[PDB]
């Protein structure tokens, strides 16, 4: 199916569609071009003065993103963290034996020369610097991500985390809805500060300042939901990554899986640059998102739900995928995992036990056995499995519009 | 069918029709003649003065298109944008390794010498120049395109995008209906500024000023709707570009497809001149429009609709195409994709599964199998597929006059 | 409507042409992958 030809004259046509912006980019294929990640910390002038600049700025108004970045770099310039063994990623070396590397041990580079108020602000603010203020600035990135009334319930947990031998209060007052601190999300340099904080403390989990993580955590695997759903599927089915892979039954789910499992990406690595591929600006279009894995996401999350996931209840229903074909596939998988137990001997003392009506479903969880069974069922889902799917979806309550939960209850519980 | 002859005397007649203006032109066949794209920026006199000239002009009145062009070139003369790898299109080189190319790195050339008010206008306007005013001038091109009450709903989203660390207000007051800023559309030079802005930031997506894009986006693939509908068909059927191609069943859809898929056009290229073929004045008659692909557009969009597209609902019904023949073709395609699932094994562990009443439709989605089936159905659409077509179109609501949605519901839901 | 032409003869001709184009669809394969499909009551039209 490479070559297509016009039959009336015997000539060749080459089908080609307008590529949806940039391809997939990939983390690895980036470090092929550059060896560093540019952190443009603009002003490097007076660190004590900056503390007051951000404090008075945040207290209702337009605090400069350039300001807070300059502050965070000054406040988090702690060269703490005793390297346990060795640290290397995508070829870039960061640590050896007993190295004492800090948090900004990737590139810094100076930028611009335009600043706002000029010099020493209000000397009002005492130290209590590193202690809570950095937590807040990083904590607003977590709050800025969302857009529903969950904000005034996640900012609530912001204020109650700046009391760890601190206890102060709050700062701004204006409701979110993307307007105030949300500007920061689209700042290449800000996001780079948050990603380097999460990465540093993912390595140094036992560090005192590792509390900065919650607020900066939402950056690890940002736009990598498909990968998360693949892990969730393994946990919920109890099968191995290999077995689950063999249960892919649609062509365009296979494609997506292959896309996600490209060999040289360090996705299974403990402490890598890979999970921060977006916020470190390594990739303009993640290979691992739901958006670029729509068939896989729907299929995986539908099965997950039939199998009694509570996550899946509220997953997004993608657009432009073959719902009918995908849904019957997910049903077979879920029906197979749900019906009939395994029960096999695991350990012995030199003494084992070997194991070996008509429309009866197969013994175990092997794809080939079930595939053969589905053929003999006229390639249509049985009454038993439809009743299984019903039982699974009914008594789900208050499911939101455009979720897989809403799709699944509506499909299977008439 | 090349030669035709008169039978009574044995002489030759050559059928030939008056060609509808110019043929198809094509982007490639343009750079065969010229190596540059002329940008005639007339006046290159005083950039600070121009800021006031456009501001007071737009505040109700006739602001000169020559003025705003002179302004935009001055304001957007930012030589920003660090080139990632390499940039080349249709033979014209623009970038290499680590080049620092700006937004007007295609031709500029000076023009005329007639200007309006003379010298320094009102020094009223501060900087806030590049920050929001260029966004507006470019944003009026988006608003100018349309002609229905959608204007006062797309100009609403104009004003709310000039607040990104800006927040001002508005400018003119007069309703659109093509009269005020609509003149600009037919300005070769203005359209060239918008197209170079969209192209620059399609490459530099991560740039700060990339917000100018929304407003200038409607230029990428202007008059290339047929290409968009071909992509949409692939997404909605889930088939490949090659498979979809084989499902063309009308002679005049084949012709159109062939026209669109001409080999040397860079249509599948990431960052090319091709999508701006109209606004950069590369083509006087797009090969890729609905107007020049009427059979394909109708066929593609009808199928798309039967398959549950929400886009297609409101697509234009072209004129002078074989509705009857086209519609029965689209029906077969949609009926084939809708009925009967695929279900095939994708991955293995050295262990595969091979797959192999009377008027029963074919197994899968192969054209030959369905074509054979349609013959045996007396070359007329079955009751089952007519009932499929009904179910598909009924309960569609408020469909506009002269759309494919209106055609389809009226054909299939009596 | 012109003058001095054979309306009767002309009109029956036009009818045949229009009737032929209106009744019965075409439906033929246009593109392939090395895999074609060859196509081949009484007063039934052609």
Would you say A308 is a known binding-site residue? no
- Using DSSP's 3-state secondary structure scheme, residue B92 falls into strand
CB atoms within 10 A of CB B328: 20
Cα(A1)–Cα(B281) distance, integer angstroms? 37
Q: What approach was used to elucidate this structure? A: cryo-EM
A5: phi then psi, degrees, rounded to nearest 5:
-140, 145
Class of CATH domain B36-218: mainly alpha
Min distance B185 CA to chain A CA atoms (Å): 25
Cα(B170)–Cα(B341) distance, integer angstroms? 54
- Compute the C-alpha angle B373/B377/B382, nearest 5°: 105
Q: What beta strand segments (E) does B153-197 contain?
A: none
- Using DSSP's 3-state secondary structure scheme, residue C29 falls into coil
CB atoms within 10 A of CB B375: 13
**Half-sphere CA count of A79, side-chain side, radius 13 A:** 5
Would you say A151 is a known binding-site residue? yes
| Nearest CA-CA partner of B326 in B249, B379, B230 | B249
What residues in C contact B230, CB-CB < 8 Å?
none
Whether the Cβ atoms of residue B204 and residue B271 lie closer than 8 Å to each other: no
Would you say B390 is a known binding-site residue? no
A113: phi then psi, degrees, rounded to nearest 5:
-165, 35
Cα(A337)–Cα(A233) distance, integer angstroms? 11
> Which residues face A95 on adjacent strands?
A87
| Nearest CA-CA partner of A27 in A292, A290, A279, A297 | A279
> Which residues face A12 on adjacent strands?
A5
Interface contact flag, A325 B338, Cβ < 8 Å: no
Count of positions (residues) in chain A: 414
CA A245 to chain centre: 20
Cα(B313)–Cα(B393) distance, integer angstroms? 10
Q: What share of chain C is helix, strand, coil (3-state, %, to 5)?
A: 35, 5, 60
Would you say A205 is a known binding-site residue? yes
For chain A, the three-class secondary structure string (H helix, E strand, C coil) is CCCEEECCCCEEECCCCCCCCCCCCCCCCCCCCCCCCCCEECCCCCHHHHHHHHHHHHCCCCCCHHHHHHHHHHHCCCCCCCCCCCEEECCEEEECCCCCCCCCCCCCEECCCCCCCCCCCCCCCCCCHHHHHHHHHHHHHHHHHCCCCCHHHHCHHHHCCCCCCCCCCCCCCCCCCCCCCHHHHHCHHHHHHHHHHHHHHHHCCCCHHHHHHCCCHHHCCCCCHHHHHHHHHHHHHCCCHHHHHHCCCCHHHHHHHHHHCCCCCCCCCCCCCHHHCCCCCCCCCCCCCCCCCHHHHHHHHHHHHHCCCCCHHHCECCCCCCHHHHHHHHHHHHHHHHCCCCCCCCCCCCCCCCCCCCCCCCCCCCHHHHHHHHHCCCCCCCHHHHHHHHHHHCCCCCCCCCEHHHHHHHHHCC
Cα(B37)–Cα(B199) distance, integer angstroms? 14
Q: Which two tokens stand for residue A262?
A: 């490209």
Whether the Cβ atoms of residue B306 and residue B334 lie closer than 8 Å to each other: yes
Min distance B332 CA to chain C CA atoms (Å): 10
Q: Output b/e per residue, A289-298; b: 16+ Cβ within 10 A.
A: bbebbbbbbb
Q: Which CATH superfamily is domain A221-413 in?
A: Nucleoprotein (1.10.3610.10)
Interface contact flag, A1 C33, Cβ < 8 Å: yes
Chain B residue with CA closest to A245: the answer is B347
Would you say B313 is a known binding-site residue? no
Q: Which helix (H) or strand (E) holds B41?
A: strand B40-41
Min distance C8 CA to chain B CA atoms (Å): 23
- Compute the C-alpha angle A214/A215/A217, nearest 5°: 65
Q: Which two tokens stand for residue A408?
A: 């699944």
Q: What is the DSSP string of B63-75?
A: --HHHHHHHHHHH
- Compute the C-alpha angle A88/A91/A94, nearest 5°: 35
Cα(A178)–Cα(A145) distance, integer angstroms? 9
The dihedral region occupied by B398, where left means phi > 0, alpha psi between -120 and 50, and beta the remainder, is: left
Name B253's Cβ contacts closer than 8 Å, sequence gap at least 6.
B295, B296, B299, B326, B329, C30
Q: What is the DSSP string of B300-351?
A: HHHHHHHTT-SSGGG-B--SSS-HHHHHHHHHHHHHHHHSS--------SS-
| Nearest CA-CA partner of A196 in A106, A135, A277 | A106
Cα(B369)–Cα(B243) distance, integer angstroms? 13
Report DSSP state, residue B376.
Answer: T
CA B38 to chain centre: 23
What residues in C contact A13, CB-CB < 8 Å?
31
CB atoms within 10 A of CB B232: 19
What residues in C contact A5, CB-CB < 8 Å?
31-32, 34
Output the CA–CA distances (angstroms, integers) from residue B326 to B248, B384, B399, C31, in the order listed: 10, 19, 21, 16
Name B10's Cβ contacts closer than 8 Å, sequence gap at least 6.
none
Cα(B317)–Cα(B294) distance, integer angstroms? 9
Pairing of strands A11-13, A40-41: unpaired
Chain breaks in chain C (C to N over 2.5 A) after: 40
Cα(A239)–Cα(A229) distance, integer angstroms? 14
Domain boundaries, chain B: 36-218, 221-413
Cα(A135)–Cα(B363) distance, integer angstroms? 60
Interface contact flag, C27 B246, Cβ < 8 Å: no
What residues in B contact C20, CB-CB < 8 Å?
none
Burial of A361 by CB count in 10 Å (0-12 exposed, 13-18 middle, 19+ buried)? middle
Q: Which two tokens stand for residue A259?
A: 């896309």
What residues in B contact C30, CB-CB < 8 Å?
246, 248-251, 253-254
């Amino acid at each position: 199916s490479v070559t297509v030809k016009r039959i009336i004259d015997n000539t060749v046509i080459v089908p080609k569609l307008p590529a949806n912006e940039d391809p997939v980019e990939y983390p690895a294929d980036y470090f092929r071009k550059s060896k560093e990640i540019p952190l443009y910390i603009n002003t490097t002038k007076s660190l004590s003065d900056l503390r007051g600049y951000v404090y008075q700025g945040l207290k209702s108004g337009n605090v400069s993103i350039i300001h807070v970045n300059s502050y965070l770099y000054g406040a988090l310039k702690d060269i703490r963290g005793k390297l346990d063994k060795d640290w290397s990623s995508f070829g870039i070396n960061i640590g050896k034996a007993g190295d004492t590397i800090g948090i900004f041990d990737l590139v810094s580079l100076k930028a611009l020369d335009g600043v706002l108020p000029d010099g020493v602000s209000d000397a009002s603010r005492t130290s209590a610097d590193d202690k809570w203020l950095p937590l807040y600035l990083l904590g607003l990135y977590r709050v800025g991500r969302t857009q529903m009334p969950e904000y005034r319930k996640k900012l609530m947990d912001g204020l109650t985390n700046q009391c760890k031998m601190i206890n102060e209060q709050f700062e701004p007052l204006v409701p979110e809805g993307r307007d105030i601190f949300d500007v920061w999300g689209n700042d290449s340099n800000y996001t780079k500060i948050v990603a380097a904080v999460d990465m540093f403390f993912h390595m140094f989990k036992k560090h005192e300042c590792a509390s900065f993580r919650y607020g900066t955590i939402v950056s690890r695997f940002k736009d990598c939901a498909a990968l998360a759903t693949f892990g969730h599927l393994c946990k919920i089915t109890g099968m191995s990554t290999e077995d689950v892979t063999t249960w892919i039954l649609n062509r365009e789910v296979a494609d997506e899986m292959v896309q996600m499992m490209l060999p040289g990406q360090e996705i299974d690595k403990a402490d890598s640059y890979m999970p921060y591929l977006i916020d470190f600006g390594l990739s303009s279009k993640s290979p691992y998102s739901s958006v670029k894995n729509p068939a896989f996401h729907f299929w995986g999350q539908l099965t997950a739900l039939l199998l009694r996931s509570t996550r899946a209840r509220n997953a997004r229903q993608p657009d432009d995928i073959e719902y009918t074909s995908l849904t019957t596939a997910g049903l077979l998988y879920a029906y197979a995992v749900g019906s009939s137990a395994d029960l096999a001997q695991q350990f012995c003392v030199g003494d084992n036990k070997y194991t070996p009506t008509t429309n009866a479903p197969p013994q175990g969880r092997d794809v080939v056995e079930w595939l053969g069974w589905f053929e003999d069922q006229n390639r249509k889902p049985t009454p038993d499995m439809m009743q299984y799917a019903k039982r699974a979806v009914m008594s789900l309550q208050g499911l939101r519009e455009k979720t897989i939960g809403k799709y699944a209850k509506s499909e299977f519980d008439k």
